[PDB]
Design a protein around this ligand. Structure first.
Ligand SMILES: [Pt+2]
Length: 66
C-alpha cells in the first residue's frame, strides 16, 4: 500500500532525520516533501509500524491516509 503522513519537518536536518529512521526500518520506498511537511511511503509495513518509525524523529506525525 501507499501511505501518506503529515510530519512536522522544519528544515534539511528534519528531512534527513525522516530519511534516517525510514532507512533503518528498511523495506520502504518513500518520498519526502519538506515544504509541504508530507512524507509518502510505499511498503508492506503496517501503518502502525510506519507511524511509530516516523515518531522516532520526535516530530509531530499524523496520518493523511491511503
Ligand atoms: Pt529542520
Amino acid at each position: 500500500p501507499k501511505h501518506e503522513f503529515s510530519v512536522d519537518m522544519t528544515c534539511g536536518g528534519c528531512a534527513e532525520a525522516v530519511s534516517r529512521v525510514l532507512n533503518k526500518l528498511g523495506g520502504v520506498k518513500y518520498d519526502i516533501d519538506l515544504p509541504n511537511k508530507k512524507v509518502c511511503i510505499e511498503s508492506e509495513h503496517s501503518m502502525d509500524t510506519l507511524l511509530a518509525t516516523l515518531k522516532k524523529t520526535g516530530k509531530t506525525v499524523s496520518y493523511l491516509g491511503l
